[PDB]
Design a protein around this ligand. Structure first.
Ligand SMILES: C[C@@H]1CC[C@@]2(OC1)O[C@H]1C[C@H]3[C@@H]4CC=C5C[C@@H](OCC[C@H](CO)CO[C@@H]6O[C@H](CO)[C@@H](O[C@H]7O[C@H](CO)[C@@H](O)[C@H](O)[C@H]7O)[C@H](O)[C@H]6O)CC[C@]5(C)[C@H]4CC[C@]3(C)[C@H]1[C@@H]2C
Ligand SMILES: C[C@@H]1CC[C@@]2(OC1)O[C@H]1C[C@H]3[C@@H]4CC=C5C[C@@H](OCC[C@H](CO)CO[C@@H]6O[C@H](CO)[C@@H](O[C@H]7O[C@H](CO)[C@@H](O)[C@H](O)[C@H]7O)[C@H](O)[C@H]6O)CC[C@]5(C)[C@H]4CC[C@]3(C)[C@H]1[C@@H]2C
Ligand SMILES: C[C@@H]1CC[C@@]2(OC1)O[C@H]1C[C@H]3[C@@H]4CC=C5C[C@@H](O)CC[C@]5(C)[C@H]4CC[C@]3(C)[C@H]1[C@@H]2C
Ligand SMILES: C[C@@H]1CC[C@@]2(OC1)O[C@H]1C[C@H]3[C@@H]4CC=C5C[C@@H](O)CC[C@]5(C)[C@H]4CC[C@]3(C)[C@H]1[C@@H]2C
Ligand SMILES: COc1ccc(/C=N/NC(=O)Cc2cccc3ccccc23)cc1OC
Ligand SMILES: COc1ccc(/C=N/NC(=O)Cc2cccc3ccccc23)cc1OC
Ligand SMILES: *[C@@H]1O[C@H](CO)[C@@H](O)[C@H](O)[C@H]1NC(C)=O
Ligand SMILES: *[C@@H]1O[C@H](CO)[C@@H](O)[C@H](O)[C@H]1NC(C)=O
Ligand SMILES: [Ca+2]
Ligand SMILES: [Ca+2]
Lengths: 622, 309
């Protein structure tokens, strides 16, 4: 059977029509067909499967069958193995999907597509067994192992494979398909991380020392010295020096260093303005440093807006805003800009001047917190941030138990100790603020224990208590109960709950570290990709880059590259050969496994015993 | 036979040697300053720091102990978790301290007190030092204090802490205490636990390697401790000017006997390896499968002959 000649578009349509009506694909096609019929031979046509693929693969499958609107039923499928793989994946037929993947031209991208579709269908599966099978699809493992073979073979053709635009998946890069598939473990592979490191260091050698890089950054003339080694590949001299300067100063690592230094400068300036150079309203006027700070924040907002909305040519504005608000650090950034605007507005007025100062102090807090996210690309700091995010839940469990016990103890002690105090603020003080401070070793026995209570003259009159002329007299009717309750509450909270929280953090760290590291590698991919369109000038100098780009656009990458036809064919042939080697090695290591040897020995011993018994019968006859 | 520059590089490659150089530099500077009236107090200060450094060297003196050395290596390995905790704590501490300084003393111009209230107090919050008497208005003592900038600078009266929005100050203190004293501290405890469990063995191997060098160092070390070691130094210098258990050269016969014994032991080792490989389960299965296949083919030939006969 010749699948290229066997599989036409008609047979593919017939295969899509002959769904067993008991799995997910039939229900999805039913919904799509009902929608198509309402909006108005074969039970389903290629438009329904195109819509299903769109739901799973937003634009990876664009033009697979819409382009010709359905194609000719009599024509051979251009990518028959791709179509069969998609058809088998869409209905959880993993054995045929494995076969069609092993028989396909572009297997890493196909495996990533299968991973994406399987994890998309795992949410839609009604039965638990099918959902479990989809959740154990192990197609990302196939992609990882095939790329391991490819990276071991060449390690240079592997990067080209990672960055080349695939023919069978609508010019989608393998890294693009991995990002869409959200393949954490594929991005954690050593080859992908090495390519990311090569991109990160730019034109410089990846073994460049950090100290020499910092010394070259602080002292620009050292760029032209041989202190920093670079990766190979009057007017001539000017061109050479300009090329060296632009090669050093446009690498992602130097851009990151400049951004970090300028953010430290921004925090220093913000704190100087807030603490030492904050002036009365415009009647007297904001200081010059405050105006520079306003301009600085304006440049920061421009960089954020550009990076978030002015980087993708084809992408929905509403979808871009949803992507922006989906990130919690972006929520922090919006909180920071809102606080800055509100504080500036209030500061411009005399009646709201102090409120403006307060809001600007909160804004400094928020920006200094953003400083944590700035260092998310560090090799050792990012996974720790992810680990903290994972331990927030143990923090919340401790907080639930502590809150219950704290409310009980605080309200009971308030009732037992100051029954006659009507002030709501002091009720809440003694009921929540004091027991909370008991956790941090702040135990003020001077107002809990009668023997320790100072004998300053104090009133029992309600009006005098409300007016604040004298403190209220703490009731000491049954103080043994107050002391006993304090003892029990201290025991519970400061021993059991605190050390239980310590134990929970220990266990969570030990069980989370590895997944946190894989997540960090996936996040590091996106962080490094963000520097491709990021200008080399840090704020506030980034205004120059913004103006230059805007003017160039109005007047007039290492990743995701398109190769010539010959090289692209050579690379796909090399990928197929590597896949054949991988499959042969798998079948070999299976064939000389202990279990297969035992099976072979048992079967052959049984057959040999039967044949020798026949021979013995013949000998007895003879 | 060893290069002077290479010897100096080897010396400065050791961090304990860096500590020793710091100690001797501090001693010399302190003595020099102490010899002068105008620098006497500075000399006393530097000599106190020098005592600190020497007492720290006392840790390295006990590096050859069976149980103490690996613990020193383990501490060296946990310094990195200390640094992670310090990064997170530094970020949160700077944020909280500067925000509280802005909210609470907006009119204080003294740089030293700005840095005090911005870093020294939040840092002490980690060790249970929470002075609510200057953070909470209801607890602030009513000693008479000035709002005049000149009087604040002169130090005649303490500045008046602003209590405009004190609920925010208390809430920020609550949140900062929660974060730093619970999450960061217990996370650091968890990180030390994991690091200890995953480091102890390699730390012990490193200690054994270091113990080799420490024991070798005693071959040329004189038996007299300081200050009596001056006698040994003078004696050796005079003997050199006027005129080991390890690394020994053997006679030819014994050396040949030892190399022959080594070769015989290596042959025994290789034979035992090949033997324990030959009677392994996998090799037995491979042998059985191959011989069963060959036997089946031969018995099939015999059965064909019997059918013919
Ligand atoms: C192993 C485990 C550890 C935990 C625990 O279980 C075991 O320990 C138990 C020990 C127990 C405690 C043992 C003992 C007591 C004492 C008892 O008093 C009863 C009241 C007595 C008897 O009528 C009278 O009171 C008087 O009040 C007056 C104030 O009104 C004071 O006047 C003051 O006036 C002014 C105040 O400024 C100043 O001039 C002076 O300061 C002073 O002149 C008197 O001086 C004082 O005499 C109350 C209970 C208490 C604290 C126990 C509580 C529970 C424990 C901690 C157990 C744990 C589970
Ligand atoms: C389970 C979890 C634990 C943590 C937490 O969440 C829950 O608990 C919450 C509880 C909450 C707190 C609840 C209540 C409050 C009170 C509130 O007051 C608002 C201001 C009021 C109302 O206009 C007025 O103030 C007045 O100021 C004056 C000073 O200017 C004082 O005069 C003093 O003058 C002199 C000072 O030396 C001396 O003569 C005396 O000392 C005294 O005469 C008055 O006495 C006092 O009345 C501020 C906020 C605070 C502290 C909450 C903070 C947040 C919590 C801890 C929550 C946690 C997240
Ligand atoms: C963690 C929660 C947050 C929400 C809350 O409980 C803890 O906070 C508490 C702080 C309380 C304030 C504290 C001080 C005053 C001043 C007083 O003159 C009038 C009452 C009022 C406004 C109180 C109203 C009730 C409030 C919001 C409580 C509220 C349930
Ligand atoms: C851990 C870092 C070390 C470096 C540093 O920040 C923490 O130390 C801080 C101590 C500060 C000192 C403290 C006291 C005074 C006295 C005052 O009359 C003039 C200003 C001056 C010298 C301050 C200048 C800025 C200094 C060095 C800060 C500096 C960023
Ligand atoms: C020890 O401090 C931290 C450790 C880890 C994170 C992770 N943020 N992970 C995020 O997604 C952002 C975020 C999350 C939650 C609360 C935040 C508050 C302020 C600022 C950012 C927040 C943040 C931390 O401080 C702010
Ligand atoms: C609990 O204290 C210690 C535990 C382990 C070491 C290891 N030093 N390991 C070294 O290589 C020397 C060194 C290293 C780093 C800082 C030092 C400061 C003072 C003195 C020596 C330093 C040191 C300690 O105190 C000084
Ligand atoms: C005790 O009460 C008197 C009023 O009679 C008052 O003058 C004094 O301030 C109170 N307490 C003290 C000793 O300060
Ligand atoms: C209160 O101010 C006065 C000046 O009028 C001063 O004498 C006194 O020392 C200040 N505080 C107190 C009560 O010590
Ligand atoms: Ca952002
Ligand atoms: Ca030494």
């Amino acid at each position: 059977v010749n699948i290229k000649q066997f599989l036409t578009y008609g047979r593919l349509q017939e295969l899509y029509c002959s769904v067993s009506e008991k799995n997910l694909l039939h229900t999805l096609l039913l919904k799509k067909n009902q929608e198509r019929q309402a909006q108005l031979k074969f039970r389903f046509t290629f438009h329904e499967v195109s819509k299903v693929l769109k739901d799973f693969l937003d634009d990876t499958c664009k033009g697979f069958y819409q382009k010709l609107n359905l194609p000719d039923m009599d024509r051979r499928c251009e990518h028959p193995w791709r179509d069969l793989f998609l058809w088998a994946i869409l209905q959880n037929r993993q054995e045929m999907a494995n076969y069609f993947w092993a028989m396909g031209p572009e297997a890493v991208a196909a495996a990533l597509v299968g991973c994406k579709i399987m994890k998309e269908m795992a949410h839609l599966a009604t039965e638990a067994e099918s959902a479990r099978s989809m959740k154990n699809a192990k197609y990302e493992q196939f992609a990882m192992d095939l790329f391991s073979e490819c990276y071991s073979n060449s390690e240079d053709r592997a990067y080209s494979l990672l960055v080349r635009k695939t023919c069978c998946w609508s010019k989608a890069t393998v890294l693009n398909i991995a990002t869409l598939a959200e393949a954490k473990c594929f991005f954690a592979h050593d080859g992908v991380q090495a390519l990311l490191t090569k991109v990160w260091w730019g034109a410089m050698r990846t073994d460049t020392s950090i100290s020499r890089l910092v010394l070259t950054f602080f002292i620009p003339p050292l760029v032209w010295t041989s202190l920093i080694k670079f990766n190979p590949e009057s007017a001539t001299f000017i061109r050479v020096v300009l090329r060296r300067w632009n090669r050093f100063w446009s690498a992602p690592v130097t851009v990151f260093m400049g951004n970090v230094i300028m953010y430290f400068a921004f925090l220093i300036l913000f704190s100087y303005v807030l603490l030492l150079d904050f002036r009365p309203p415009p009647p007297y006027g904001p200081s010059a440093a405050e105006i520079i700070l306003y301009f600085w924040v304006f440049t920061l907002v421009l960089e954020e807006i550009r990076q978030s909305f002015f980087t993708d040519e084809d992408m929905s504005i509403l979808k871009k805003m949803k992507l922006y608000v989906e990130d919690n650090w972006n929520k922090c950034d919006m909180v920071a800009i809102s606080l800055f605007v509100v504080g500036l507005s209030c500061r411009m007025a005399m009646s709201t001047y102090e409120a403006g100062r307060t809001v600007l102090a909160l804004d400094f807090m928020v920006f200094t917190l953003r400083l944590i996210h700035i260092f998310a690309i560090h090799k050792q700091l990012g996974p720790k941030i992810i680990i903290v995010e994972r331990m927030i839940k143990d923090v919340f469990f401790f907080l639930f138990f502590l809150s219950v016990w704290l409310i009980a103890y605080g309200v009971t002690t308030q009732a037992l100790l100051h029954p006659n105090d009507p002030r709501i603020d002091w009720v809440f003080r003694r009921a929540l603020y004091r027991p909370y401070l008991h956790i941090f070793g702040q135990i003020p026995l001077e107002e809990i224990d009668a023997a320790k209570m100072p004998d300053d003259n104090c009133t029992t009159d309600v009006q005098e208590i409300i007016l604040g002329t004298l403190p209220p007299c703490p009731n000491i009717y049954a103080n043994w109960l107050v002391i006993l309750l304090l003892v029990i509450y201290l025991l519970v909270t400061n021993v059991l709950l605190l050390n239980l929280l310590i134990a929970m953090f220990s266990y969570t760290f030990q069980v989370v570290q590895e997944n946190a590291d894989i997540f960090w590698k996936f996040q590091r991919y996106n962080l490094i990709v963000e520097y491709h369109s990021r200008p080399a000038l840090a704020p506030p100098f980034i205004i120059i880059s913004h103006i230059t780009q805007a003017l160039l656009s109005f007047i007039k990458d290492l990743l995701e590259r398109e190769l010539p036809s010959g090289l692209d064919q050579k690379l796909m042939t090399w990928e197929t050969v590597q896949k054949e080697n991988y499959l042969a090695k798998l079948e070999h290591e299976h064939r000389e496994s202990s279990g297969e040897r035992l099976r072979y020995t048992s079967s052959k011993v049984q057959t040999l015993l039967r044949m020798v018994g026949g021979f013995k019968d013949q000998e007895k006859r003879m």
